[PDB]
Design a protein around this nucleic acid. Sequence first.
RNA 1: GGAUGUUGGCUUAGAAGCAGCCAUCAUUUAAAGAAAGCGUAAUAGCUCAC
RNA 2: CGGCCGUAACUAUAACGGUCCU
RNA 3: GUCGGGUAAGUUCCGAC
RNA 4: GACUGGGGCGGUC
RNA 5: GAACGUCGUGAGACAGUUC
RNA 6: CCUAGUACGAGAGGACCGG
RNA 7: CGUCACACCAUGGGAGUG
RNA 8: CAUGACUGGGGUGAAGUCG
Lengths: 141, 185, 122
Amino acid sequence: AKKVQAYVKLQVAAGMANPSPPVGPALGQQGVNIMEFCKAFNAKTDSIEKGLPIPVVITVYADRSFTFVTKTPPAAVLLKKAAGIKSGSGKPNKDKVGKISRAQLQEIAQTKAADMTGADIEAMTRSIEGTARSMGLVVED
Amino acid sequence: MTLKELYAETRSHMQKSLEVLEHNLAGLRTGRANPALLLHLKVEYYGAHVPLNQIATVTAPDPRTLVVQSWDQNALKAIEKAIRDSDLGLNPSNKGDALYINIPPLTEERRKDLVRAVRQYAEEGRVAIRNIRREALDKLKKLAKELHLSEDETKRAEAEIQKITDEFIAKADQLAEKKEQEILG
Amino acid sequence: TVNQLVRKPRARKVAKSNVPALEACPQKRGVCTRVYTTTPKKPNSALRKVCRVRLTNGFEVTSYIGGEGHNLQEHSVILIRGGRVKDLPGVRYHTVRGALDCSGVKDRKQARSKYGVKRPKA
RNA sequence: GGAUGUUGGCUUAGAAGCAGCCAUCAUUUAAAGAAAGCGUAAUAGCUCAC
RNA sequence: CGGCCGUAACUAUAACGGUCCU
RNA sequence: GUCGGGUAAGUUCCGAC
RNA sequence: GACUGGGGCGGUC
RNA sequence: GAACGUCGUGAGACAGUUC
RNA sequence: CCUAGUACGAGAGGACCGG
RNA sequence: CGUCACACCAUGGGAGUG
RNA sequence: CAUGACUGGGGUGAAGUCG
């Protein structure tokens, strides 16, 4: 929506960071300061919400300094917790791993509303449904 | 018999002789110089348990030495602590950017003693196949008299038996020669 | 009689030393062709351990590998000593225990000199 | 101009439109394929459909 | 002045056994 | 023919079976 | 003895 | 010319060997 | 042999083109 | 007791070879 | 004096076949 600048995107757990494989080398290649971010990220993430993986967009500058915006957790993850399942279908639509009431879809749609473009609630729900269909999660209306 | 059954029998017999030859040859002393052997080993790489193949390669330039190149230096260490006492009992050496893992050698003197044995097994196959051609010719002689086959018929039958012979001779030569190169490598 | 003696006196007797690895030596080095487990004579039973040796002087010969615990290979270098063995014919030698590329009895606390042992765990 | 859920789910060391398997909806719209090819270790980036 | 068949420690051979006719 | 010999290499040759 | 895709062998008269 | 094996009562013969 | 022990390659090894 | 199998040990003979 | 296709007898062994 603005001028595109160098920046990495990744989904890190709420209250935890700094391991090399998960993070470190990922943004580390960019010139990011892992230590600062790990502490910085976990700082606000505890308040926003712990226990839920939240994707964040790191924006590094020429100063190799950086900023990041914390958005809402992915639709897939919220659907997984709502479904009460650990993973997706593996073979979506063919085999249903779990289900979600339409009410919950509205809840998730509500949560991600900030990130969603949907003009109305019905709209955002329909978008959430899209994710559910891809993960083998049916919705009971 | 008939000509058709003589051919079928002869070809069967020779094939069976070729199979005894295949058996005598097909043993080899390689059986620990395999590269696929070490891919199952979980390697400690950055405290994670990455499979050996994803972190390293195992090549064999000969089946005497085995060299294991490991992309990362830390991983190479943890590969070394597994090659030895596990169930293999091998002896890796740290030599270069790869582990050299020696497999039992064979002196050149024993290599002579081995190549002659191959040729002896080769000769057991060939002698059997030629003796079957000989026997087939003998059977054809009886058959010719018995079924009152003409001379020309018998010569056509001889050519057919001979053609079958030369195929099994050819197959024998190929088997021996290939095994010879394996032994010499 | 003196006369019969003056002509053809009293002949000696070339002492036949039952030992191919002669050379008048206390022992001889070998190479070990293989490791057998041949059976004894008629009076005794139980399979003993032996092994053909390619003595330094070429003279091949099987030596006994006494001790309650063998540990030789088909290429290991041992040292022949002597002293034949009854139950085992043709086997008129024994491999030195605790010498060359051989080993030596384990956990043995009696008759340490013989076999392979030198002052136990104290 | 080619957006958002979304790096779709699975798989995988990684698989983010573009190794592979399944699905291929919904939202914003003037338009915008869970994407046509190149490309990256994977992203990125470039070009295409419209 | 003979055949056919089975057979011992890695095979291969078979001292051995069988069997048909001289 | 097979093995050995001579030869850098020997359908001939020499020694065997 | 002949016939015979020379003759012969084979086969047929 | 001669010989062996073999094919033929045989003269001889062989997509065999031998001097 | 020079190019060039270079390109390529983990090493091992080892060109193109042209002379 | 002597063949005849095997497996080792030493040894005579040998086209000849060094 | 060393060695050689093959070959003869000798010696052990574990004791097999045959008497």
